[PDB]
Amino acid sequence: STGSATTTPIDSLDDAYITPVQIGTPAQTLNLDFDTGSSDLWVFSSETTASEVDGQTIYTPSKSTTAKLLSGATWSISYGDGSSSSGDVYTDTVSVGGLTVTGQAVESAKKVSSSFTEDSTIDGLLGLAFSTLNTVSPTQQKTFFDNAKASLDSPVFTADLGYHAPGTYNFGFIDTTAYTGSITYTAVSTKQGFWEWTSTGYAVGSGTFKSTSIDGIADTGTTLLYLPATVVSAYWAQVSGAKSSSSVGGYVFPCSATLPSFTFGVGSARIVIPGDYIDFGPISTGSSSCFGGIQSSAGIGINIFGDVALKAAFVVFNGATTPTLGFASK
Ligand SMILES: NCc1ccc(C(F)(F)F)cc1
């Protein structure tokens, strides 16, 4: 079987993408952020502290005939940006774009950080990293992808994120009409639980391609591109008036500048990120300083190929026994 769901940016800057997901019987539809950098399916619920909910749609397990409390199970998670959430755990039926999994762990948020509360468009997260990162204790739970794998035609899902436009998450098949040329596959390391791979180098604008190994993760749940300081410095050196700002928290640039493209390597292939994708607009309303979409990973400790990079490509997450990552131009 297969599934296919449209994913929509939550705002005019593509800060995150939401995808409708059916939970429970009868279906309760929530808009979840599909996150290949985490492995928990957690949702705002009727159990979330009332003051911590501001316009989100909430999952109500008491109205689902298929919901079952997973007795004794708790979850607690903290994301790389400082966000956090925790609660108890139900099992229920979960469908994405026609693909249905029964008995999926649905982690009901009893407490959520302020970052999630103030984002009324995101009802929760659907983790698509490897199940070894799932935070449910004492019995670790499987992701939606892991539970669906056996019934999928192929153990793959693809991310086709749009630039200021809706996109598609497909499960179980590869849409050969959604990309140009060939797909280049590269090996994945699962040792940290991420879709971790090694880029073969980079180029700035029309400059020469620098062959160098960049280890990083493919993360749909991260907005920007986080690369080593040496690469990020070489990119922003080409932008007139760009500088790293300690008060803003990263590289900013005059909103009047035009940004060069950024090219990253996938084996022998090249993926080009247009300069317009790296513009994240004024740092405050009316400011003439704009925020850059390529930032340094030095504070984070791992390089992150977030949405800025992934939306320039058609990306295959091949979850075979030897996992691989496929990239194609589109
Ligand atoms: N979007 C999930 C996510 C967030 C942060 C990290 C970090 F910071 F640990 F790399 C990994 C994955």
Side-chain angles (χ1 to χ4, degrees), residues 35-38 78-81 125 194 217 219-222 300 302 304:
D35 180 10
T36 61
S38 71
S78 294
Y79 299 95
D81 71 312
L125 268 68
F194 295 121
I217 62 156
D219 186 2
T220 63
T222 290
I300 287 149
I302 180 160
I304 303 174

Side-chain angles (χ1 to χ4, degrees), residues 1-3 94-96 98-102 104 143-148 150-156 171-173:
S1 65
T2 63
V94 172
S95 290
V96 173
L99 173 57
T100 298
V101 173
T102 56
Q104 169 69 41
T143 70
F144 178 79
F145 183 51
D146 269 347
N147 284 329
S151 58
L152 290 179
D153 291 1
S154 316
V156 304
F171 288 85
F173 75 100

Side-chain angles (χ1 to χ4, degrees), residues 256-297:
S256 63
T258 79
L259 300 174
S261 64
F262 184 83
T263 297
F264 65 95
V266 181
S268 41
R270 313 297 173 231
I271 301 296
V272 184
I273 304 165
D276 288 337
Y277 290 27
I278 301 163
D279 188 343
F280 273 76
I283 78 187
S284 284
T285 312
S287 182
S288 70
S289 303
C290 275
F291 194 70
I294 294 173
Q295 298 294 342
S296 174
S297 65

Side-chain angles (χ1 to χ4, degrees), residues 14 23 35 61 91 114-115 119 130 133 160-161 212-213 215 257 269 306 326:
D14 298 347
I23 308 177
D35 180 10
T91 62
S114 55
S115 301
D119 220 316
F130 294 95
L133 295 180
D160 184 7
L161 305 174
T212 181
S213 293
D215 181 287

Side-chain angles (χ1 to χ4, degrees), residues 28-62 64-141 143-148 150-190 192-242 244-302:
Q28 309 181 24
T29 297
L30 271 71
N31 298 327
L32 307 190
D33 183 356
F34 283 23
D35 180 10
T36 61
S38 71
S39 306
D40 286 51
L41 198 177
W42 73 258
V43 295
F44 281 81
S45 72
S46 55
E47 314 187 305
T48 311
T49 320
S51 73
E52 289 181 10
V53 170
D54 184 13
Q56 288 89 1
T57 292
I58 71 151
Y59 168 57
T60 307
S62 69
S64 175
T65 65
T66 42
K68 205 187 156 180
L69 172 79
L70 198 62
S71 154
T74 63
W75 63 278
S76 211
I77 199 192
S78 294
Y79 299 95
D81 71 312
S83 297
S84 312
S85 47
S86 70
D88 42 33
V89 187
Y90 294 83
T91 62
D92 210 333
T93 298
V94 172
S95 290
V96 173
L99 173 57
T100 298
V101 173
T102 56
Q104 169 69 41
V106 177
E107 311 172 23
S108 171
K110 267 142 136 73
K111 204 191 182 17
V112 310
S113 49
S114 55
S115 301
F116 297 108
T117 299
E118 283 149 311
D119 220 316
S120 317
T121 64
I122 299 172
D123 303 324
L125 268 68
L126 194 138
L128 292 169
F130 294 95
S131 294
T132 53
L133 295 180
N134 177 266
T135 76
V136 175
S137 154
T139 311
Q140 204 154 41
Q141 300 296 309
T143 70
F144 178 79
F145 183 51
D146 269 347
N147 284 329
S151 58
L152 290 179
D153 291 1
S154 316
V156 304
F157 69 93
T158 68
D160 184 7
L161 305 174
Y163 171 66
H164 301 335
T168 306
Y169 278 109
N170 286 334
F171 288 85
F173 75 100
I174 294 174
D175 189 345
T176 59
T177 74
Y179 61 88
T180 63
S182 291
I183 306 179
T184 303
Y185 291 86
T186 194
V188 163
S189 166
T190 63
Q192 303 183 264
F194 295 121
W195 291 92
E196 189 177 0
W197 64 291
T198 305
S199 173
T200 49
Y202 73 101
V204 179
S206 308
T208 323
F209 185 90
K210 169 71 154 183
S211 309
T212 181
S213 293
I214 302 162
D215 181 287
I217 62 156
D219 186 2
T220 63
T222 290
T223 311
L224 309 179
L225 179 47
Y226 292 95
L227 289 174
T230 52
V231 179
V232 177
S233 181
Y235 177 83
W236 287 111
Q238 300 303 314
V239 180
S240 194
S244 183
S245 175
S246 206
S247 39
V248 179
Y251 281 89
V252 296
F253 66 97
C255 291
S256 63
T258 79
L259 300 174
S261 64
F262 184 83
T263 297
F264 65 95
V266 181
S268 41
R270 313 297 173 231
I271 301 296
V272 184
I273 304 165
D276 288 337
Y277 290 27
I278 301 163
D279 188 343
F280 273 76
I283 78 187
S284 284
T285 312
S287 182
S288 70
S289 303
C290 275
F291 194 70
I294 294 173
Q295 298 294 342
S296 174
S297 65
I300 287 149
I302 180 160

